[PDB]
A paper describes a structure:
Channels in this family share a common architecture, with each of the five subunits contributing to an extracellular domain (ECD) with 10 strands (β1–β10) and a transmembrane domain (TMD) with 4 helices (M1–M4).
The hydroxyl group at the C3 position of [name] generates a stereogenic center, resulting in R and S enantiomeric forms; although (R)-[name] is a modestly more potent anticonvulsant, the compound is applied clinically as a racemic mixture. Consistent with our previous structure with GABA27, the desensitized state with [name] exhibited further lockdown of loop C (4.3 Å S264-Cα translation) and rotation between the ECD and TMD (7.3°) relative to the partially-locked state. As in medical practice, we used a racemic mixture in our experiments, such that our cryo-EM densities likely contained both forms; indeed, either (R)- or (S)-[name] could be modeled into the ligand density in either structure.
Residue numbers in the entry:
A (entry chain D), B (entry chain C), C (entry chain B), D (entry chain E), E (entry chain A): 78 to 377, 451 to 479
The structure:
Amino acid sequence: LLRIDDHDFSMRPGFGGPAIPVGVDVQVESLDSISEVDMDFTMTLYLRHYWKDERLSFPSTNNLSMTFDGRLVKKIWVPDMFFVHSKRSFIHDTTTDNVMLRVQPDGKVLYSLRVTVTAMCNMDFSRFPLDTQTCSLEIESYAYTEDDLMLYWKKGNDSLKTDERISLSQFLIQEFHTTTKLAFYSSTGWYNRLYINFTLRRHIFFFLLQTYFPATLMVMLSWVSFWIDRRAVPARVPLGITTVLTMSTIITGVNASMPRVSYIKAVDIYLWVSFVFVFLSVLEYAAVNYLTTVQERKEQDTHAIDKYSRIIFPAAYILFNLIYWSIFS
Amino acid sequence: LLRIDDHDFSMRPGFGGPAIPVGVDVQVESLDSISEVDMDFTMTLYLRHYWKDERLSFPSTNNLSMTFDGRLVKKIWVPDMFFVHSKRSFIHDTTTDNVMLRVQPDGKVLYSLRVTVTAMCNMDFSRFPLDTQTCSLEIESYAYTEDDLMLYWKKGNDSLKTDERISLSQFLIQEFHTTTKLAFYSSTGWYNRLYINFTLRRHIFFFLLQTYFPATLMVMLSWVSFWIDRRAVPARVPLGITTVLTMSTIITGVNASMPRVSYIKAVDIYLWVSFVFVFLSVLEYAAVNYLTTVQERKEQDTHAIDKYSRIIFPAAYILFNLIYWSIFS
Amino acid sequence: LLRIDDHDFSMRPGFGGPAIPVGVDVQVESLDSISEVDMDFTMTLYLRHYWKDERLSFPSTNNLSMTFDGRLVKKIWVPDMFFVHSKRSFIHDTTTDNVMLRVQPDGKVLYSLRVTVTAMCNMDFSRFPLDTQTCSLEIESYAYTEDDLMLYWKKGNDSLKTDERISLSQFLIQEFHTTTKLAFYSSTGWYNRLYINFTLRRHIFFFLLQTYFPATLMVMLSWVSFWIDRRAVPARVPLGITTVLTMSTIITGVNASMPRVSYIKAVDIYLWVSFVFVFLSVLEYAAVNYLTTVQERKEQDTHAIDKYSRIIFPAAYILFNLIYWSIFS
Amino acid sequence: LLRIDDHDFSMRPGFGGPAIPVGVDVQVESLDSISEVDMDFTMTLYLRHYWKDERLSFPSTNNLSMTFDGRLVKKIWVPDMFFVHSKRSFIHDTTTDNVMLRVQPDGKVLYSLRVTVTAMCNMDFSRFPLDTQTCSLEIESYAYTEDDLMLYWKKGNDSLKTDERISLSQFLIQEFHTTTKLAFYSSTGWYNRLYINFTLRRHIFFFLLQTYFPATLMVMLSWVSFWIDRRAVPARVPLGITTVLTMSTIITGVNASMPRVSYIKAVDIYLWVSFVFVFLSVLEYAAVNYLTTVQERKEQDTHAIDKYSRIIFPAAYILFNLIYWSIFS
Amino acid sequence: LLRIDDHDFSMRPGFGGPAIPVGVDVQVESLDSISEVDMDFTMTLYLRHYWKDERLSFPSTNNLSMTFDGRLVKKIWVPDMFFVHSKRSFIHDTTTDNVMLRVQPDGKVLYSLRVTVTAMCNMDFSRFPLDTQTCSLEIESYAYTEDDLMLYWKKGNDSLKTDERISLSQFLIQEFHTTTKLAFYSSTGWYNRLYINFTLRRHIFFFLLQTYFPATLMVMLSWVSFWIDRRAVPARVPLGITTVLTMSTIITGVNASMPRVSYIKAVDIYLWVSFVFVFLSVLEYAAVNYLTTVQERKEQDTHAIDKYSRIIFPAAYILFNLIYWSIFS
Ligand SMILES: CCCCCCCCCC
Ligand SMILES: CCCCCCCCCC
Ligand SMILES: CCCCCCCCCC
Ligand SMILES: CCCCCCCCCC
Ligand SMILES: CCCCCCCCCC
Ligand SMILES: CCCCCCCC
Ligand SMILES: CCCCCCCC
Ligand SMILES: CCCCCCCC
Ligand SMILES: CCCCCCCC
Ligand SMILES: CCCCCCCC
Ligand SMILES: CCCCCCCC
Ligand SMILES: CCCCCCCC
Ligand SMILES: CCCCCCCC
Ligand SMILES: CCCCCCCC
Ligand SMILES: CCCCCCCC
Ligand SMILES: NC[C@H](O)CC(=O)O
Ligand SMILES: NC[C@H](O)CC(=O)O
Ligand SMILES: NC[C@H](O)CC(=O)O
Ligand SMILES: NC[C@H](O)CC(=O)O
Ligand SMILES: NC[C@H](O)CC(=O)O
Ligand SMILES: CCCCCC
Ligand SMILES: CCCCCC
Ligand SMILES: CCCCCC
Ligand SMILES: CCCCCC
Ligand SMILES: CCCCCC
Ligand SMILES: CCCCCC
Ligand SMILES: CCCCCC
Ligand SMILES: CCCCCC
Ligand SMILES: CCCCCC
Ligand SMILES: CCCCCC
Ligand SMILES: [Cl-]
Ligand SMILES: [Cl-]
């Protein structure tokens, strides 16, 4: 039906003349995973192309579109899109190549394929884990400059659809939209580039329950010492030491999961402030013990330091929490 | 025998006319693995197709079906099924492609292949680990709409068989069955979709023995303090502190295995209630020590608080367990 | 030499007539790994096929066998064996495909290839780690029923050889042998199936030294308490608590390595019995302390409980060990 | 257009005569990851080739360059570059091969491709983590010696461009530049080799906060003992022991992450010196207890050892830190 | 130039007559990694072949060798070497297949390729980590017996070269050399086999510092108890218990890294002897406490046991170390 043997498909339509326009639209099937250690995400989508080539015209009386097997895609000419700044990708091939080709009697062509991509995304963790991130996926032609191929969104802002099943267990997904920009390479020229943009927001419940509550409970345990007879030395000393030693484990367990950045995160501040709060309660009792021994040496109830600590330590911690949650909201 | 050189197999049977019907049936060989962190499962199965094409007719006197090598599959026309919402898949190829082709003298065709698939499954962990999940595998044609191809289960509900060897170490598998539904894509049209459905139920014995028993034993250890002379301060203080510090480790060891969901699970409730039960026994003795020191200061047996705690703490824990196992059964 | 252009190799020898017999023999090169979490093993072997096809006859005066390059395998007809219930496999291809083809002047053919397979194996862990497992590898034709192809072991029981280098660090390997059985699929018919069977036995030394000895040592540490003055409360209390808290870690470290089965293993019994032995020694001293305080209240040496515990606890543990190693031998 | 059927492209241009010159230039897209355990890095780049072949001449009036599909690359002759000392690499192929071919009417050719490489890099950890590393990527022709192919940087030092987005979370990247050298293989001859060089510098903030601070805090905790009444034996003994036991965990947690080198690293020195500082404070109190018991035996305030330790231990640690940070800056 | 269309390259040179000799030589580029858990190593090398075939003769006046593209390798005949007892391998293919072909006017051929291999190696850990291992890589023809192909090292012992960059962070590499042996398969015949042999020696510094020193320090901590007043029960009891409990962690941390062998390693002996040394110091004080209580009961300084332990325990440990390092050197 299609006159495939007649023509040299190594050359584009309009070869030697003005640029060929090619339109694009997209449907996202899933957003698959995200990594902070590697700074990347994975996405699966359907991608579609539109153009006209009169070498693929055929006669009919119905003026309708026809579908063809799919093994003809490797005989005709086809555009050459690639994903910019991507780590890896593939096209699906079970039970056969997931490819579709439809042609109109005047030579208009529709071409579609299903693909999975993993792409680069630079992340900022200064407000972690109360953070927000923004991402994009880039599309461009490899071989042809804007003097030979013209690339655009087919229907404007309506060119992007999203599956209603899309979900991530740790993030809220929002603000899908599309943009365009021109790009330059020194050795080869100017190119059109298409963008798909979106925003992510992290859920905090896991981190409350797994980090912020136990640190608070250790701080509250250290306060119990102020309520115990100053004469019970082998009770008051280990009570403080054990809380110091636990707070160290919590600090280690948090930071072992993240990338080794060169700046402080919002969770680090909270944990290290709680550490100094616990550390100071040990020096307090050391002072009380020394001053009591001096009194014994002079001579040979509740001490004022205990009496004041019972008020001062909790008030200070409450002030710190008010400030912190005013800053990070 | 088969006139393969005579015809253009880029076009379907009945091209330009009414839709071709294609029937399907399936046998599941194994259900291979399941992930909560990734929310997916893996399955291996045999998949079969049935249709008629008169371009593949041949003469004989016996009216019987014949089997052909398998290298002819890439010369003739073949339907184009794909698995919807799937992460990855392949066809087996040792010692050769695991493919079968049988043809009748009137052009009826039987086509079979062996495949492994990994597929998406959304999971709810609010009753974990006493939870039940339901899953499905989706089948659809990539290129042809319901105006060109008609897809149906060959024998109705009898179209699905299951291997007697199928098993999972952590789940009971039940309720295999098949359904159909129509699907719409904005840019390309209407399609028939086939479903395979099943249900999973988790075994709880591992979690009893590995989580619920040790937390109970820590709670029962904290009660021993009420039976010890109030004068033995360096004994009664560490006995409580060490149980608090162990309960924290159990809490951490559980949640380090699961996805970071934004809601509380049924096991979290039990562990955090046990934590507060243990935490309170430390404040109890702090109160007894303070009140004894006040009595000493005034002046200068078993305390009522101990006497009452010996009854109140165990009764409250038993009430809590009755309620909990009434709710989660 | 071979008349390859003359014939249609899409059709088997004797197409349209009685079944073709095909003989098989095997040499195992290595048994590569085993997984309890995944319930599978990996094997590498050489696999050989024997049949006659008169379309491959050629003239000679010597009546001897000749070897051919190997690129002819994709032109002639070849049998279609696959491994049943397998997870994955491949054929080796460095520096070229590891394939061999030899032909006799009357058309007798010998065909060989090297392959690696990973296969399913259901395992029972009720006597773990003193357990024994049995495994098998299954071989069958994909497309041809017993009416068209007949599959058998070439030399009877002599058809299976094993490399003298085969070894596993954790198991003793024994009892290699071969069997045959007929198989039925509802939609497609009856098939011949060949089996390779073997047995595995686990070495226990690692588990003695890494699990059973330290649990025993914790139990023996708990007994030291009975030998210490009942007046040293802050010594006798932590001595018991610390052993409870260590035994919990041993229990956790064992079960974190295995699949989450729904039944008790032989190592679980030992560890949980040792746990209760240690748990009881804490209640013992609690009783002694309470009864001493009652005597003080009445009034205002070694206690009989200590005196009896010094005999009763070790005797009971020794009785338990005699029974256990009588049952699991 | 191009006379591809006319010529034998198994032979290079100028076959049997002087060497063909081939020029190269490069743009780096990303530096992807680095491993100390494996001693390697990963890089993604665009690579370009320039040469003339008169068998690819064609007539035109415009004297301009033309772009061709890309399926012609496997028909014509093309240079054979490989990456020396590399572990693995691939060329990107979605949605098609990422390859470009441009030709001028006189037969000048431009050839480009996108690739990812993982390459060997020998590392020195004697000043870890205050260390600096230098790396390079090597390029060479596989089959042709300098008598048949001549390989050079196209534009001198201007032949290397770098993407402005390039970043690593743990390193500062600096000093990109290019060099050339001749290489010899005994069996096959002399070859031209091109180099791409760069330098890396590690950020230290993570290691301060995660290793050096907690070790210092343990040392400062051990000093508190000198301020406590020498009569409180069950307080002063555990205070020292627990710090020894914590310092061991820090030492283990650091070295579990790195390769098992045969020499001491700069972080090892700090940690083991802090260990001996803590170890000595236990022997100190042992001495005080023994000497006090001797005084009791003779007979039957603050001891001079405590009085002097309160000054000597901190001064010594401060001297050690001054020296250390003078050496490692 | 080469008459490729004239001949049947499915047949070897001298087909039907005496065996063809094929010579080999090798250059090792890198030794990439080693695993004790899997018992294997990985190697990358260049491999070369030499033979004569008069079907590849061509006329010239210069009598020199010529290089050809590399796409002709799949048209001519080529030998069929494979690596015996190997787990996996591949040939490098970026930017093209890393293959070289050179031919002389009389039909002498040189063939080269670059490859990476992973190979089996049986290891003995009875003297671990002071152990020495020996390894080899095996080379053989798949399809042709010694009656049809003759395989030998081209230049004798000079056939093996090694890159000066080769290094491993944990081993000293020594004693590279080559051997030959004949091999028999029951079903198929006799074959020539080539060997590459080498030796490895482990560096011990990591294990000194990470295992042997801390165990010694725990033993020395247990001795401090003998220097403390026998009346300080809550000090002397935990001092011993905590060292027992730490030594258990060291024992576990070592053996969690290695394969689960059925025999004792040299490091196990040291650690378990140190364990009993620490265990005995607890029974010592238990005895002293009991005997003191008996003296109190009779009645109603330093004990001889302490006095003797202060000499006996260290002397015994020093004797043990002398013997151990005399045996394992
Ligand atoms: C880490 C040094 C701690 C010193 C404590 C001094 C207390 C003095 C009380 C007057
Ligand atoms: C965490 C603060 C604990 C305060 C305990 C107060 C006890 C008062 C007893 C009357
Ligand atoms: C967990 C509850 C423990 C109760 C101990 C009671 C001892 C009574 C001795 C007569
Ligand atoms: C590890 C041996 C410790 C010995 C301490 C001796 C102290 C003597 C004080 C005079
Ligand atoms: C594990 C049993 C320990 C028994 C200690 C007995 C000491 C007796 C001293 C005479
Ligand atoms: C102690 C944790 C407090 C968490 C407050 C969160 C406010 C949104
Ligand atoms: C940008 C630094 C914020 C630090 C705030 C500290 C709140 C107590
Ligand atoms: C302490 C755990 C109790 C578990 C009860 C389970 C009831 C089915
Ligand atoms: C849906 C919340 C259930 C909480 C029940 C608490 C049982 C003590
Ligand atoms: C305490 C462990 C005893 C192990 C006995 C094993 C008997 C074969
Ligand atoms: C099948 C259960 C065996 C339990 C034996 C217990 C031995 C003390
Ligand atoms: C206690 C850590 C001190 C770190 C000093 C770093 C100086 C650049
Ligand atoms: C090259 C060894 C440096 C050691 C310096 C020690 C500083 C206290
Ligand atoms: C305490 C460890 C001693 C190590 C001695 C090593 C002798 C080569
Ligand atoms: C082969 C056993 C060696 C054991 C030596 C023990 C040294 C104290
Ligand atoms: N748009 C792709 C680039 O032009 C590739 C290159 O720079 O070679
Ligand atoms: N049924 C497959 C879809 O039609 C693919 C697409 O939307 O392009
Ligand atoms: N023996 C292979 C089976 O017949 C395959 C199938 O059931 O389709
Ligand atoms: N430049 C590549 C080397 O010549 C390859 C080999 O030595 O065979
Ligand atoms: N040398 C390879 C072996 O002959 C292969 C086989 O035994 O089939
Ligand atoms: C940005 C610095 C914050 C530090 C608070 C301790
Ligand atoms: C004390 C916690 C209050 C924080 C409110 C955001
Ligand atoms: C759904 C909330 C339950 C919380 C019980 C503490
Ligand atoms: C106290 C446990 C009983 C729960 C019964 C389901
Ligand atoms: C099979 C049950 C055994 C349980 C022993 C405690
Ligand atoms: C007490 C251990 C003896 C067990 C013998 C099998
Ligand atoms: C290079 C040796 C340094 C050791 C310092 C303790
Ligand atoms: C005591 C820390 C000072 C180090 C300055 C580099
Ligand atoms: C080979 C046995 C050695 C055991 C030493 C305790
Ligand atoms: C006490 C350690 C000496 C060992 C010498 C090899
Ligand atoms: Cl005490
Ligand atoms: Cl204590």
